Ligand binder design. Structure first.
Ligand code: HEM
Length: 147
């Protein structure tokens, strides 16, 4: 759902997470560590492994879309409609068997990459606001994927 305080914490820490590369470095770290930890997930993405060039490319696109979702957080119906559309496109991505269960371990890796970039700015309040935001953003994508 996200409270106004949680929307405000994610909107303000996104400025630091985005940096000067629109979160591309965070995206690269997230998917590289995720695929190094679960080699079994490389086939779901259609990648050869964690060092496939496609990992850094996908990481930049995922984090750029989270930046769009963050700018629309004040209108939930807008944010979920656009994330559902992203989700509908995932029916035809990677192996065409992307499952909802895969999104929760990916969330842990995203939060970790975010904290690695902004350090202490990713305090307990920021981690809770971003876990709440990642739950809504991925939840809406999963809804498009299962539609
Ligand atoms: C573990 C779950 C996920 C899997 C397996 C997955 C897989 C993929 C794959 C394989 C592509 C490349 C498409 C191509 O070849 O053209 C893709 C694109 C994309 N993914 Fe995901 N994805 C996942 C999670 C996410 C998340 C959390 C977001 C949330 C913002 C996201 C956003 C996107 C975006 C924006 C694109 C670019 C193309 C588009 O807009 O549809 N993905 N994803």
């Amino acid at each position: 759902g996200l409270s106004a305080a949680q929307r405000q914490v994610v909107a303000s820490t996104w400025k630091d997470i985005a940096g000067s590369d629109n979160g591309a470095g965070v995206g690269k770290e997230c998917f590289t560590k995720f695929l190094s930890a679960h080699h079994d997930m490389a086939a779901v993405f259609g990648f050869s492994g964690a060092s496939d060039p496609g990992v850094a490319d996908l990481g930049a696109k995922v984090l750029a879309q989270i930046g769009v979702a963050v700018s629309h957080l004040g209108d939930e119906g807008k944010m979920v409609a656009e994330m559902k559309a992203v989700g509908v496109r995932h029916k035809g991505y990677g192996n065409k068997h992307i499952k909802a269960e895969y999104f929760e371990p990916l969330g842990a890796s995203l939060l970790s990459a975010m904290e690695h970039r902004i350090g202490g700015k990713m305090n307990a309040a920021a981690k809770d606001a971003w876990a709440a935001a990642y739950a809504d953003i991925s939840g809406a994508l999963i809804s498009g994927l299962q539609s």
